[PDB]
């Protein structure tokens, strides 16, 4: 039921799961001829590209982490600290 960008108690870090699904969804779009936001310095494999987009923080996605009570927090991929 929405939670202000402030008062977020959830981890600043990306979960292995979040990352896995983000790399999976994004790779699906790349494989379907969807535009890429990172300079393709050779890479051709969609996932390999998706990963490059994650590092350079150019994936316009948002994770809606729901809490067991129904409420939820909204974190942007860009915002999430990636270290797994």
């Amino acid at each position: 039921k929405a939670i202000p960008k402030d008062q977020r108690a959830t981890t600043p870090y990306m979960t292995k799961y979040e990352r896995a699904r983000i790399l999976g969804t994004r790779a699906l779009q790349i494989s379907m001829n969807a535009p890429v936001f990172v300079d393709l310095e050779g890479e051709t494999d969609p996932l390999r590209i998706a990963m490059k987009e994650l590092a350079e923080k150019k994936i316009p996605l948002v994770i809606r982490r729901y809490l067991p009570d129904g409420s939820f927090e909204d974190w942007s991929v860009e915002e999430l600290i990636v270290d797994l």
Binding site: L67, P68, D69, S71
Partner: protein, 215 residues
């Protein structure tokens, strides 16, 4: 030569200590000294000239501590009762069920010997809001809460209780449970709907605190 009666006095004495300690943990003013009443002083201060103990005079009253009242305001006084009759009867309990109700005692603890008549047992729930508790001496000869495996149980105030549910954002049904007739809940006179913070040692972290709501 004092045969059975000898080691029979020691049991009434020990159980008396458990009742003192129990009342103290509930939040009533009691001297550590009184709790550690040596056996010999007991045999004197509570026994007649024959070797037999007079339970009638062991009974006492307990008052909430200043500290206890700061959290639980509705905590009135307490009355403990040691019945001289082995098997309590309806006529015997009635006198008790009235004593409490009369002196406006909020809680009445009835400590009996062997057992009580099922007839008399159905005389407890009959003087709201004052509640009456029963304890078999045998079950008090030892304080269970003094056992390694038994961690610290702390009755929470309705305040803390609200605070608890608010932060973890939980329904009452989502909290771990503890049976009403659970030995420890019986010890702390827990009432349905009440929450207890359980502070236990952990080999994983230092301490770990869990919660249980009395069913």
């Amino acid at each position: 030569m004092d045969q059975e009666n000898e080691r029979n006095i020691s049991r009434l004495w020990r159980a008396f200590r458990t009742v003192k300690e129990m009342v103290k943990d509930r939040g009533y003013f009691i001297t550590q000294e009184e709790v550690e009443l040596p056996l010999e002083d007991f045999k004197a201060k509570y026994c007649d000239s024959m070797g037999r103990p007079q339970r009638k005079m062991m009974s006492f009253q307990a008052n909430p501590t200043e500290e206890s009242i700061s959290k639980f305001p509705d905590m009135g006084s307490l009355w403990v009762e040691f019945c001289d009759e082995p098997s309590v009867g309806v006529k015997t309990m009635k006198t008790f069920v009235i004593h409490i109700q009369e002196k406006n005692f909020q809680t009445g603890i009835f400590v009996y010997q062997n057992n009580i008549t099922p007839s008399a047992m159905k005389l407890v729930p009959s003087i709201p809001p004052a509640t009456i508790e029963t304890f078999n001496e045998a079950a008090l000869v030892v304080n269970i809460t003094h056992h390694e495996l038994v961690p610290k149980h702390i009755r929470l105030s309705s305040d803390e209780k609200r605070e608890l549910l608010k932060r973890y954002r939980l329904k009452e049904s989502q909290l771990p449970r503890i049976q009403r007739a659970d030995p420890v809940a019986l010890y702390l006179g827990l009432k349905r709907g009440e929450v207890v913070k359980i502070i236990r040692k952990s080999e994983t972290s230092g301490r770990y605190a869990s919660y249980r709501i009395c069913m």
